[PDB]
A paper describes a structure:
The NRPS enzymes that produce the β-lactam antibiotic nocardicin A (1) exhibit several unusual features. In contrast, NocTE is a unique example where a thioesterase domain catalyzes a functionally unidirectional L → D epimerization that expands the known repertoire in nature to achieve this simple but powerful modification. The overall structure of NocTE is similar to known TE domain structures of NRPS and polyketide synthase (PKS) enzymes. The NocTE active site structure with its catalytic triad Ser1779, His1901, and Asp1806 is similar to canonical Type-I thioesterase domains.
We have, therefore, designed and prepared a fluorophosphonate (FP, 4) analog of nocardicin G that captures an accurate substrate acyl-enzyme mimic of the final tetrahedral transition state leading to product release and provides an intimate view of the complete peptide substrate not previously observed in an NRPS TE domain active site. We, therefore, identified new crystal growth conditions of the covalently modified NocTE accessed by preincubation with FP 4. The covalently modified NocTE crystallized in space group P212121 with four protein chains in the asymmetric unit. The structure of NocTE bound to ligand showed excellent density for the covalent modification of Ser1779 in all four chains. The density was unequivocal for the complete ligand in chains A and B. Electron density was of lower quality in chains C and D. A glycerol molecule from the cryoprotection solution is located between the phosphonate moiety and bulk solvent in three chains. No density was observed in any of the four chains for a methyl group attached to the phosphonate of the ligand, likely owing to hydrolysis, or well-precedented “aging”, during the extended period of crystal growth. The NocTE-complex structure with the “aged” phosphonate–Ser adduct (loss of methanol) mimics closely the tetrahedral covalent intermediate of the hydrolysis half-reaction. The N-terminal Hpg group sits in a hydrophobic groove formed by Pro1819, Val1823, Leu1847, Gly1850, and Ala1854. The planar β-lactam ring is positioned at the center of the active site cavity and makes hydrophobic interaction through Cβ with Leu1846 and Gly1716. The His1808 side chain has fully rotated away from the active site to accommodate positioning of the C-terminal Hpg group. The backbone amides of Gly1716 and Phe1780 are in hydrogen bonding distances of 2.7 and 2.9 Å to one phospho-oxygen of the ligand and form the oxyanion hole. Catalytic His1901 is positioned to hydrogen bond with the second phospho-oxygen group, indicating that this oxygen may mimic the attacking water molecule in the post-epimerization hydrolysis reaction (see below).
Residue numbers in the entry: 1696 to 1922
Write the structure that this text describes.
């Protein structure tokens, strides 16, 4: 229902990708022909479009998703990741799974930020609406209403989540936006939290990484990070 598998007959490995802040794993579908020999398990938010029975914490969402992953891929080692918010969820999943004794060989953070380290800007909903308008999404259409609520709830879960230290291998893919700024620190991470980290550049803007025109570069960055 909310777990979809692309390239299900592939024999080259498996990757689990968690939806970004807008709640749907649809942007990952374009990866299938670029990673045709990787089974891609893509998770969407089962509460998308609902106002009730929301997750109370990011850790609860991660726990549900770990159950899904274990049903889909009962044997490790596991490779987990996600774009933006999805990466943060993947981190918590990896943490939980590694504490239970599962092997997580790769954690993929595609331009993920740690908003728990960030200052409160302005009104949260006003900010989400303004950003959606800038992205050409109508915030008062029905789809827009669902997406606004999704971004609001996932952003608040992320801001509440204080990430743990994670000792497994982590790949952080970063857009070319930092310059002399440290790319790890600028996203609210540090090497005490992520001691085994490789930073991979990926071209394009945060929002456009899974556009058709960027998918090939992004897939190359993913492939390099995984091997
Ligand atoms: P991502 O899934 O796109 C991630 C994100 C986007 C851009 C950044 O610079 C950093 C992270 N997103 C989208 C989602 N929601 C928000 O970021 C909201 N602005 C938000 C944030 C925090 C609260 O409390 C409420 C709303 C998120 O985490
Ligand atoms: Ca408001
Ligand atoms: Ca290219």
């Amino acid at each position: 229902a909310y777990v979809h598998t692309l390239n299900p007959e592939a024999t080259g490995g498996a990757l689990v990708l968690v939806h970004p802040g807008e709640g749907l794993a649809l942007p990952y579908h374009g990866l299938a022909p670029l990673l045709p020999d990787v089974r891609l398990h893509v998770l969407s938010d089962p509460r998308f479009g609902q106002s009730d029975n929301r997750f109370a914490t990011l850790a609860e969402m991660a726990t549900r998703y770990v159950e899904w992953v274990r049903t889909t891929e009962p044997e490790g080692p596991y490779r987990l990741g996600g774009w933006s918010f999805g990466g943060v969820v993947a981190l918590e999943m990896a943490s939980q799974m590694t504490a239970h004794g599962d092997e997580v060989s790769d954690l993929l953070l595609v331009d993920s930020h740690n908003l728990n380290a960030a200052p409160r800007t302005g009104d949260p909903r006003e900010g989400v609406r303004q950003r959606l308008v800038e992205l050409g999404v109508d915030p008062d259409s029905p789809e827009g209403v669902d997406v606004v609520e999704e971004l609001l709830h996932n952003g608040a879960l992320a801001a509440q989540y204080a990430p743990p230290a994670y000792r497994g291998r982590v790949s952080l893919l970063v857009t070319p936006t930092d310059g002399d700024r440290d790319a790890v620190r600028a996203r609210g991470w540090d090497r005490a939290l992520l001691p085994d980290l490789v930073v991979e550049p990926v071209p394009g803007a945060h929002e456009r990484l899974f556009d058709e025109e960027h998918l090939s570069d992004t897939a190359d960055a993913i492939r390099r990070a995984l091997g």
